[PDB]
Write a protein that binds this ligand. Structure first.
Ligand SMILES: CO[C@@H]1O[C@H](CO)[C@@H](O[C@@H]2O[C@H](CO)[C@@H](S[C@@H]3O[C@H](CO)[C@@H](O[C@@H]4O[C@H](CO)[C@@H](O)[C@H](O)[C@H]4O)[C@H](O)[C@H]3O)[C@H](O)[C@H]2O)[C@H](O)[C@H]1O
Ligand SMILES: *[C@@H]1O[C@H](CO)[C@@H](O)[C@H](O)[C@H]1NC(C)=O
Length: 364
């Protein structure tokens, strides 16, 4: 079915069984404290995005979640539940990263692999047209074209990132779908020197895709820890005037809008509850200490440019291993402000989950 306006309005957000199963089968059994177990049980019901970060998730997790939502909706959910999904499998993924877990390479049929990926997701979404579906498109992709074109892998991947983003925006432009392209965070693209070129890039992509109706705007702070709005700039933000997501979005949207893209925003707050964080530098993204679960997902943001506060990166799922000998070890995960020992990216990290619980704001 079609919708008008903010896709988060008039629906409830589904909390998926993948995350719920991590909490119940992996987290809770390691927790003996009654209060923390009850808090954990509660966090399992908070509706976070489900990531299609590996091809195998398409015909498993995506189908499962949409099937489960349809079942719940047909069983009388009111209002109806909506899905929240991340598309995250570009070839030569994370081009500026020290290490990537992306499975596909441009040199190894990655373009065709990705197009097939998008085409299968399209088929599944059509099959589940009765479940409104909100997508985040490719974290850590086009933000690299703004600042990291000096990196050979990024320069070599740029035309592919662009073409394939346009491909996804057109192929997933379906009436029951909404899309938000990733747009980094205040401490990446919000810096004054970066913000106009970022607006130029995103608005051009939007134009080049034919301004598809399903595209609502942009997603910010995905997998990061920034504040939505705080009175004093965290120390590691200096000297950025855009020291929180509200400042970034208020500066960014007029630039985008003048360029033909009046983007609405969704802002990750899943690990933003504690401010300031334990990050020693803004760019320390990996398993940062001193962070907490943040404000609960809601369409009622109170801000004219923000369609929803969301939990995109699910807290407790590791950002990367701290084992320096591991094949895909990223040195950011070995820093003094990265919690250790940490398992491989995407694996449950229980000590990190407990940290997020203890620092939760609002508390569980
Ligand atoms: C006054 O001029 C400005 O000075 C400041 C301070 O020196 C400059 O700040 C620096 O901006 C850089 C970007 O231009 C970033 S690097 C940026 O960091 C982010 C994380 O915050 C990286 O994205 C993450 O990438 C990970 C993989 O490596 C992903 O796993 C993760 O999901 C992403 O968030 C990004 O790739 C990097 O390019 C510096 O941290 C910051 O100090 C500013 O540039 C000057 O204009
Ligand atoms: C991706 O998964 C699909 C099934 O959803 C499969 O048909 C395809 O072969 C997989 N892609 C690659 C490159 O292995």
């Amino acid at each position: 079915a079609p919708y008008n306006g903010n896709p988060f309005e008039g629906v409830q957000l589904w909390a998926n069984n993948y995350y719920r199963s991590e909490v119940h089968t992996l987290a809770i059994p390691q927790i003996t404290d009654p209060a923390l177990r009850a808090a954990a049980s509660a966090v399992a019901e908070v509706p976070s995005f489900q990531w299609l970060d590996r091809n195998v998730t398409v015909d498993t997790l995506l189908v499962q979640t949409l099937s489960e939502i349809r079942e719940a909706n047909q069983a009388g959910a009111n209002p109806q539940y909506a899905a929240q999904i991340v598309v995250y499998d570009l070839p030569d993924r994370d081009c500026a990263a020290a290490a990537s877990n992306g499975e596909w390479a441009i040199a190894n049929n990655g373009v065709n692999n990705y197009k097939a990926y998008i085409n299968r997701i399209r088929e599944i979404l059509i099959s589940f047209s009765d479940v409104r579906t909100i997508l985040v498109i490719e974290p850590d992709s086009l933000a690299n074209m703004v600042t990291n074109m000096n990196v050979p892998k990024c320069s070599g991947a740029a035309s592919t990132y662009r073409e394939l983003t346009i491909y996804a925006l057109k192929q997933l432009d379906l009436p029951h779908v909404a899309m938000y392209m990733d747009a980094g965070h205040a401490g990446w693209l919000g810096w004054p020197a970066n913000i106009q070129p970022a607006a130029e890039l995103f608005a051009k992509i939007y134009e080049d895709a034919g301004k598809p109706r399903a595209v609502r705007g942009l997603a910010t702070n995905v997998a990061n820890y920034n504040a939505w709005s705080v009175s004093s700039p965290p120390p590691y933000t200096s000297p950025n005037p855009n020291y929180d997501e509200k400042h970034y979005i208020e500066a960014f949207r007029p630039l985008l809008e003048a360029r033909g893209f009046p983007a609405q925003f969704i802002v990750d707050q899943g690990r933003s509850g504690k401010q300031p964080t334990g990050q020693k530098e803004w760019g320390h993204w990996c398993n940062a200490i001193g962070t907490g679960f943040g404000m609960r997902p809601t369409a009622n943001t109170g801000h004219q440019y923000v369609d929803a506060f969301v939990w995109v990166k699910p807290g407790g799922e590791c950002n990367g291993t701290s084992d320096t000998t591991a094949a895909r070890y990223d040195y950011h995960c070995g820093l003094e402000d990265a919690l250790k020992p940490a398992p491989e990216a995407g694996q449950w990290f229980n000590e990190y989950f407990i940290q997020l619980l203890r620092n939760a704001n609002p508390p569980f």
